[model samples]
Target: SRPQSTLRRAITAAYRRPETECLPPLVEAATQSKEIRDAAASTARKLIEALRGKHSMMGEQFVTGETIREALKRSKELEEKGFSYSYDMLGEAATTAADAERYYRDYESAIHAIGKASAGRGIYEGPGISIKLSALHPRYSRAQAARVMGELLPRVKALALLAKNYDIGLNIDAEEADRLELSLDLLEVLCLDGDLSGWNGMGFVVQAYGKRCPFVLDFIIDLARRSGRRIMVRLVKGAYWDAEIKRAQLDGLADFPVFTRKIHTDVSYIACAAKLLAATDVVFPQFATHNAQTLAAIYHMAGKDFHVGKYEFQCLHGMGEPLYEEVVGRGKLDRPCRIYAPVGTHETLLAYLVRRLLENGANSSFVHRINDPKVSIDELIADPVEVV
Candidate 1:
């Protein structure tokens, strides 16, 4: 209702065309006319100043803090409001061994900090940590499976062990579609490892937008059952949709690995949610979404039965607060909401910021549509299952 709406408008306008394609040409054309030159220069300068200023609104809204200690201190207020958090350190895929090492150290430090804060709170009640496998290994792909297993697994296992010792949850975040199976390999080994067995603190993410999400959940449920551990699964409506589509077309693949339409993804999410609810005995289901319709559907599907560990809901730190506020406390939905808070400096935050904008700024996205006055509640919450 404040600067966020203005910021959203600016981002929506910027997304209509690439900055390089639109801005540079305008600046160049300004040379042909003095009036145009003055106007173009002023416009560009003001826009850049607002977006890249010292206290950039974009950074303020997306990133939780510059460091874990800062983020944890900031999250205390939210925790008291009946919400928990899962802190994610911001960084992209490592390009070199040095970069990976730095990320590993950062993750280790964050775990210790979060674990210490969560000491007596127990796994479900306390905050947790989410890590990206790509950031831990320079080469995290199917082709480099052996190296990833040899190198990345040990790093992840160490982190998981630390989380286990503190009785806190550690989740492996879902990345690109190509790394799906590769991540599963790590999950399997970690779950079955004797050292980490009997600890339900280990978690994994499943992107419902992917075609293989249901099947992947099948494997995870089975793994949990066989390993005799309660795996925490965070179900999200895919973040890398744009990248996945572009990659498939560029590679001349027969078909996209993800659903082509938004409704398809929504349908898949509901279907996957059903599966997760059914497997609650073997796995802890974390439903991560910002859609009211989706949330309502799931809430009804879950029935009235409730408990501390039956299941929980999740939302992004800054964006999903309003929606989750109604779902968190006992006076409300009586369900726990875990805030996916990203912690990092301005530089590392750039990659994550762009991804969030690209994913949610689009017209088709639920976050974008919900903010528009034109979108009615009925339209917003239309049953994805019935539509399909």
Candidate 2:
């Protein structure tokens, strides 16, 4: 459902080094549990084998053209059907600072590529980008995370400033729990310090499932006022629930990053959107959802209760057709809507696709798209099964 993740997934697959281990368990889990874990390990191993097996053969489907120009050319064909795109560069979940910087540089180039693709293009706007903070460093430590943030802020600021200069937008992606705090703080520091408010230049991805969301808004609003910049808050049901909760369970941590119920998260997402519409001094609240009813509810609130320019409806590129066109029908001021379009090569896009599959399998809106009569069952059958 979150399309920008596609390029991230693909890039990680293509670029992730074998020497790196992404999980904390890899470092601490003892040799003592090997046997017990082995029993479970074999099955998971076979599954992974099948995945990389598919990767070596089918990498092209995930990692299409090598360059952004070609990817945009292809993705623009998809956009002709009434969708905006949130393109991403492959290669995230980096291990070293150098790897992180490589990813960052690619994103910087992607921003430039978006500008090139949109120039003299037919669409009112070109495309957008989705960037993950973790590519800078692990999220658990503030000092390290901020160090990466310090590197990225200038690049991100330049990119956002370019987007504002060119009328395209950029959104930062959220990651697993421990680092989210550090990640978000660094994002705020960048926005506040860079003076990135207004014109939809700096947008944050807020997980409504988090208990801290209310405080996040308060912080952003306060930061914006102090900095004299306008920031856009992008609200979503969140992607890290399963992985994050699993981390807490394994680590014996009591508090989890996400709530237990999907319904609760969904409800909170709508509630938060409405609240931001009402009280924030200035914002371009973009609701990142494909839910028709929820989109309607948010649009109603924005139209009836807030300034039309204050809110925009956003969804993934491939997941919502009717909702995409529905926003089109809502007169010119019907709250601008965007469909995040992630672009990258095949091996680079799998992890993003896995999350998309999981979200589609869970949310009704995504489910509807997958199950719609127009969708080809043969296509789903042909595609590799993604991560849950």
Candidate 3:
């Protein structure tokens, strides 16, 4: 059951990963054969329908609800508790213009709902929406420079204006490492635009697991200076660790995009956090983690003068309720915690829930440890830096 080599670990991780497309080689080849492919497609269609019904149920637990009204109600309760919400519409990345058009409409309507619901709240740090650029344009790639600039830029500008009008921040969700450069280009283009030059709440997410995290923080600072506006940066441990490993091997790349060891990710996270917190003038740091050790380290490093709302802590809605309760409850840090809530029908939450399940299944995940009775508190609270 134990892996003794890098290749063995990579293969083991890939096999255990929940992604639909990350199939083993033999299965992959079988799916490629035309006769088997057609036969499988017939059964797969029916099986998919039933699987989605099950996935939809799982979505109910993680997501706020099937309707925007329900989601708003949930947000209202969180706000009452000194917490906030950043609602994400459930769906996979768009792979076609038709798919993208649907995403655009869903977001456009969702923004209006959020804007109307939170009006007169007057730019207080509360509920906001996170947008995935991949869902806005089917071709969100660095290779499609002209298309991204011409097509994607206009769509993002409109969304930014919509958010600005409502006094709500719009956060660009991070994706695969290969898409990082394109996402940065997209972020800079929106921020640099004179029309949005005055919007201080515009933001983007960064992965601490990535080797370029420190460089990315520098880039954010540089952009802030160039645009003369504040930028919110959400530093996460990243969600695509397994995929990144599998991708590097499949492509025969020189190295993995993310750090191989869990401790390395924690080290990178604290290092990046220090940089983000120190640049408070231009960057508002949101540390998203369920690790108590990670949060404790950040609290100590943030110094005595670090005010509550200037920067905040974020955790997923249903996943870290207990941990966040301690973080926000009586005699606690009493700091603001933002719930990264997903809101959509069960029909759209399949991919999102599957990924969440895979992350929980990982041996070293904090969420996994917290749920297991056999795992000790000291083990969960051990300093990540010392583990290295």
Candidate 4:
């Protein structure tokens, strides 16, 4: 009932805000004087710079490499913990040919190092890398599909082959709403277009917060069935909810691209999980969540088959360590857990850390409520759809 009230209030407030003021909570504070607002934005960045290396959530957690030899040491440490790492090369989206090519070289080197480290560990699949397609090319737009096909396709295909050679997984990370269709097209291309076709170890993510999530599921299943390549599908609740809502409203759109209520996203997550689980013939479902209720729902619906299959759970590197340690140590649920680890420099880390803060700081977020002793266990674990 309280969550429902919260949902109602949030929807009301979203529409009440003036279109010009409809900005994501993280950036809404900059609606004033250019000078003062610039300071408002840059001040916190200076604090971030000061706190960068000293914070556990920042430099200490990331896996970085000045040279391939240097980064493998951290990858090997993760392997010893019975955990696999998906290294996300942390940097802002590219704006130039030089920057894009620079990232490609760094990604290739990291893949080679990870592959070399996992060599002779015959029983386990080695470390994988998560790539942002927007970073691979300067003009990664749907309108520029032809250019992307010519430039971006070649670069990613090379990385895919390198990943395959090392027996590692390569995942294409999701971007903003405008780029969703382009990302989907690229996914199909990588999975079916050329020699890169039929690489089962590679996959891409689907964000469940989008209203079109079910349709995306249909697209992936159809793609896998049509190509005969078993694709890995990482189901996430999405990270860009605030930006999606603000972007739609500011543009005077008919509706938001994302579900307004958090409960709706939670419901969509479970429904999408059920769909992914049932389609294991063509999909390898990887559910990423820190919520216990969502995890339980997947475990129950996945039935006896998921325990022995490729389905597993995911959590951020330094954030959910204790909770996952308990989950992985328990009886029937000693499942393989992968850390969505981000690795790079402090400048690259600023953007990542800010998003994590906004996600976890929301009043209704599990990360926020779990720390509040007043919130009961039942309240925390109650059915999300039922509550709303």
Candidate 5:
């Protein structure tokens, strides 16, 4: 096995080429030669203008559409290709009551459009929606627990009921570590609520990079068993790694709540996958990843037995298509893969774009390493369990 330092160096070298060759070199050369500085400036302007054009390559590749209708129209083609979708309306944290209200309305309208497209197909077969709690309330924090429970709960419940009525799934997306337990309180209430009883469409996301992942799963499983409703659980490696690290340092905390090393996160992910697979009877497991090694590990760990609602895999819409194509069809891996499609206009896509870059652009990220030709198949698929 290659040493961690060696593997890290390869990834860093691959990521640095674009950084050095892009605009920095042009700026540097312009400084050295005053006569051609104007020419260099023009070239830089053209490059920037091209990237900002109406039909932006980056926007088209990452975002599904500017609106729900447009996104649904695009989703039909993917559905035909034997893949499913979970539409996430793109917006970040709301800082005001008006902003929260607007986000709530956006989600409401999106559900109607998505539900209409579902056309009576059940949760497992039909498209679903992923909601962010921060978008529903202006103050969604531990200190504002009471306000969230009072104000935010009703909005989420209304959305959940709408989703249940349409027989489509409604998933609560995971956020920062501070709000983990607070979100669970909302989940526990929603799960055990008599109004939502007998509906297996309620779903929640768990981030494996956090130290509390396994214990969190334990609570979810026990809640599922007690409520006697099968909950849909989507497992993901945490996305706010850099922010989390910086926040802990700024706060002068004792230690980071999330794993500092990528391999530790991978090990935690695999171990959590085992726990999720074993609880299949009570919760539907959704493995959301872009790593081939992680996918292969979970695919085999799940055993050969297959059914519609047994378990499913998830990936980001624009990023995960090619890899999942080989896994979705019957002749291929014969596993059901759901694409987490983001829908919004350019204005709202800025935050989502930045977060995606931070999550996948890191040198240690599996998506980044996998794309580097220097990373061999053996190295790409090295067992995290053994390495840790």
Candidate 6:
């Protein structure tokens, strides 16, 4: 429906504008002192990082607990509560193909490690892995970048077989508009390349912000239908908002495609999500948002059958406490509500947290969290706020 090339230019332009405009004003207003400048600059950097096309990893290097067992143990608790998780071993943008290969191995090890510790637990719905294609190459690499995938793809291809062996499913993460085409190429390889039929244990993400959302959905549906594979597509509105715009401006593109207006974006999400749900076959969608309107749309579109694993709801591990309760407690529909729990350290997690904060900020709380002061403390309890 829309051109990925045009969208990419728009996104790149959007990201750089803030660095040039927003940050300068913010830096100047903060203070001219070196100490203040450093702090301001650093904070500004974090904010811009949100706008950048980087895969926002939550941990500095990888997602880990003080102990691997501890991480699994907590996830076990969430699993017990009718929620499941997509474990993401946080490594983003491998500088070299070697680095990409190494990260692939690390994720492989993480998967095997989980399998070893989790035998017979069924405590997990099943293991799922989230991946960043860039982890297979530098986002701004000069080469074809397909070379990087060459290093990692074989292992990833083998991974589906391995994952199927362990009843695990893998989910690919979508990056900025600039990288969307490559992301789709890799997704097709995983989903349609081999005998990825029903038993392949693979799924991929499709961002709602992409101008080509409609076309992508249609393509996946056809791909899955022909392969006889049950398609699992996680749909997030998108994270690289400002970055996409800045990129487009710098490259002198006509219009920004990723939801330039809030009303248009929100309405379009409801429309696209409903359309995907209606498509039924080959469309197993995941509504991953804290917005009440979007959440409500899921129920309105999906009736009771949705309870039978037709769809799922995902909340961030670090945020979305309010909606979390509503979904977990007698969800509008009988289906399970998945709460994402990001396990990683600050260094790796900053970019992700920054995006979460910048995207939602105080508004997210106002929209989702109930702030009635009249409710007694005994009547109310602290909720899990996955976002900072």
Q: Return the TM-score for each candidate structure.
A: 0.84, 0.69, 0.82, 0.80, 0.84, 0.73
Q: lDDT score, residue 356, model 5?
A: 84
All candidates' lDDT scores? 0.78, 0.57, 0.72, 0.68, 0.78, 0.57
Clashing pairs in 5: none
lDDT of 2: 0.57
Q: In candidate 3, which residue pairs get closer than 3 Å at backbone N, Cα or C atoms, i.e. clash? A: none
Q: Model 3 off-target regions past 4 Å?
A: 1-57, 122-124, 139-143
For model 5, residues 1-388, the per-residue Cα lDDT tens digits are 5433443343233321332232232222112233332343343333223322522236568888889999999998889978899999988688888998999999999999899999999899999999999999996753368878899999999999999888899999999888876787899899989998777999999987776776678778988988988999999998888888898899777656777767767777877888899999999999999777777677766767999899999999877886777678887678899999999888788777777888667788776776566866556655666543
Model 5 CA deviation exceeding 4 Å by range:
1-57
- Per-residue lDDT of 1-388 in model 3, one digit per residue for the tens? 5422443334334322332222222122112234433343343233223322543235466888676677987677668777777878766578788988898888888888887887746343557888888788876643366676678888988988998888887888888887876777778778788887566768899998776666677777878877887888999989888888898899876556677767767777877787888888888889998776677667656666756557888888776566666566446665778888887876787677777877878878876666577976556555555443
Residue-level lDDT tens digits of model 4 in 194-248: 6865457677898877766666777788778878877888999988777777888
Candidate 2's C-alpha runs over 4 A off are 1-66, 74-83, 118-126, 138-143, 150-155, 161-167, 194-200, 279-281, 305-308, 330-335, 363-388
Worst 10-residue lDDT window for candidate 4 reads 23-32
* CA shift of 66, model 4, Å: 7.1
Q: What RMSD does model 6 have?
A: 12.9
Comparing 2 with 3 on TM-score, the higher-scoring candidate is 3
How many clashes show up in model 1?
Answer: 0
Cα deviation of 70 in candidate 5 (Å)? 0.7
Per-candidate clashes come to 0, 18, 0, 0, 0, 29
- Write down the TM-score for model 4: 0.80
